[PDB]
Amino acid sequence: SMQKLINSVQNYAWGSKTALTELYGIANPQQQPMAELWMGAHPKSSSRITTVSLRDAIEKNKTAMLGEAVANRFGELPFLFKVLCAAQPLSIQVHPNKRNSEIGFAKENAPMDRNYKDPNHAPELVFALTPFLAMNAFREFSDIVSLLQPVAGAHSAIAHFLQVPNAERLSQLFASLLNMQGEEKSRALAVLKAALNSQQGEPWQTIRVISEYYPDDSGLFSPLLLNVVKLNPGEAMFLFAETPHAYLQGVALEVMANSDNVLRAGLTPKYIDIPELVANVKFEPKPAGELLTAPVKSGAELDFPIPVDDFAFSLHDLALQETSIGQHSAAILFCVEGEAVLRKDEQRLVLKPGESAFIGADESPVNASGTGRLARVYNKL
Numbered sequence: 242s243m244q245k246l247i248n249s250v251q252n253y254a255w256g257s258k259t260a261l262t263e264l265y266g267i268a269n270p271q272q273q274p275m276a277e278l279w280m281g282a283h284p285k286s287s288s289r290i291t292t293v294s295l296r297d298a299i300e301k302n303k304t305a306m307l308g309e310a311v312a313n314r315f316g317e318l319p320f321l322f323k324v325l326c327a328a329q330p331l332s333i334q335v336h337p338n339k340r341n342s343e344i345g346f347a348k349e350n351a352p353m354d355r356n357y358k359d360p361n362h363a364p365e366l367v368f369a370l371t372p373f374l375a376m377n378a379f380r381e382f383s384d385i386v387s388l389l390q391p392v393a394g395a396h397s398a399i400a401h402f403l404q405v406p407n408a409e410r411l412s413q414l415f416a417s418l419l420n421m422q423g424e425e426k427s428r429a430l431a432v433l434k435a436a437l438n439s440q441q442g443e444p445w446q447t448i449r450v451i452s453e454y455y456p457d458d459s460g461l462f463s464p465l466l467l468n469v470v471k472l473n474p475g476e477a478m479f480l481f482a483e484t485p486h487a488y489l490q491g492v493a494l495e496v497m498a499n500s501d502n503v504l505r506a507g508l509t510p511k512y513i514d515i516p517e518l519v520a521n522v523k524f525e526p527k528p529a530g531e532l533l534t535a536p537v538k539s540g541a542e543l544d545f546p547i548p549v550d551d552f553a554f555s556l557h558d559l560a561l562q563e564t565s566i567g568q569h570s571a572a573i574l575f576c577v578e579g580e581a582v583l584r585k586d587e588q589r590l591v592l593k594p595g596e597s598a599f600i601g602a603d604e605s606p607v608n609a610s611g612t613g614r615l616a617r618v619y620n621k622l
């Protein structure tokens with residue numbers, strides 16, 4: 242009924258050597274970086290159940306596993322669920338919208354794995370498991386101005402912006418910063434990196450955190466353009482389309498639609514097509530108090546509303562008295578802390594922290610009890 246998941250760990254060079262072990266007791270005796278723990282049915286690394294591919298168990302029976310609304314809307318598990326362990330800051334990224342991902346995939350086809358690997362859009366939610374430092378969206382024009390003034394002599398475009406703090410200038414400035422070359426770029430970093438020494442607090446400290454991993458990158462300027470946030474454990478943010486963001490430090494749950502598309506906007510050595518980037522970015526400020534997702538608590542369930550149909554995400558507080566958890570779709574249940582006893586009829590499945598279970602549509606509901614919390618990814622249709 243309930244299938245305990247065997248999950249892939251991506252050992253990207255940027256991953257923590259200790260965070261998955263320290264939190265969840267996941268073994269790592271050769272000390273590889275452990276960057277992402279994948280829960281789902283990705284074609285390149287499907288989670289498995291007891292052994293067989295979860296992705297294969299789904300395609301063998303879509304209706305029973307996904308439920309009819311999901312199988313008729315998506316035709317597969319419509320999300321991928323990760324624990325992300327960033328021991329280094331990652332690249333700034335923008336997800337183009339649906340329309341433009343279609344255009345992009347199609348246009349590239351006339352080279353391959355390319356930024357449009359895939360004609361799908363890529364909504365994302367991140368959920369902090371440990372203090373999680375990030376960038377999300379442009380700051381308010383007035384705060385952009387205040388933060389740039391200590392470095393205004395850095396580059397002509399900054400001066401141009403400060404003189405007229407509008408969306409065009411921000412856009413020009415964004416583009417101008419990424420297209421700095423040679424000594425144009427050095428005059429710029431020097432104004433910035435020398436001026437890290439006579440400024441205090443944030444966002445300067447964040448810049449200083451990034452400069453360890455990216456000394457020679459124009460994205461060192463981004464924390465002046467973009468809202469820096471430290472998510473506390475249990476807070477979350479949705480990453481909209483056309484909105485620069487980056488995951489800089491810490492451990493989180495990440496849910497995403499199935500798209501591998503991404504336009505990089507800095508903190509990266511790879512080539513960046515700035516025209517392509519700039520056409521797919523929304524140069525509107527976004528206030529600090531709209532960044533986090535406001536959850537809704539009902540009973541023991543804390544739901545985080547997602548403005549997109551592709552997935553939904555809820556936290557469930559376990560009590561020693563059983564509670565019912567059900568959905569009209571497939572769900573993945575992931576133990577965040579404590580310990581969860583799952584029961585369906587005669588079946589009992591214990592989840593320790595970091596362990597997950599796949600619950601097919603035809604196996605809802607299940608009874609959960611124990612201590613701590615369980616995260617669930619599912620679909621509300």
Ligand SMILES: [Zn+2]
Pocket residue numbers: 334365480486
């Ligand atoms: Zn993203």
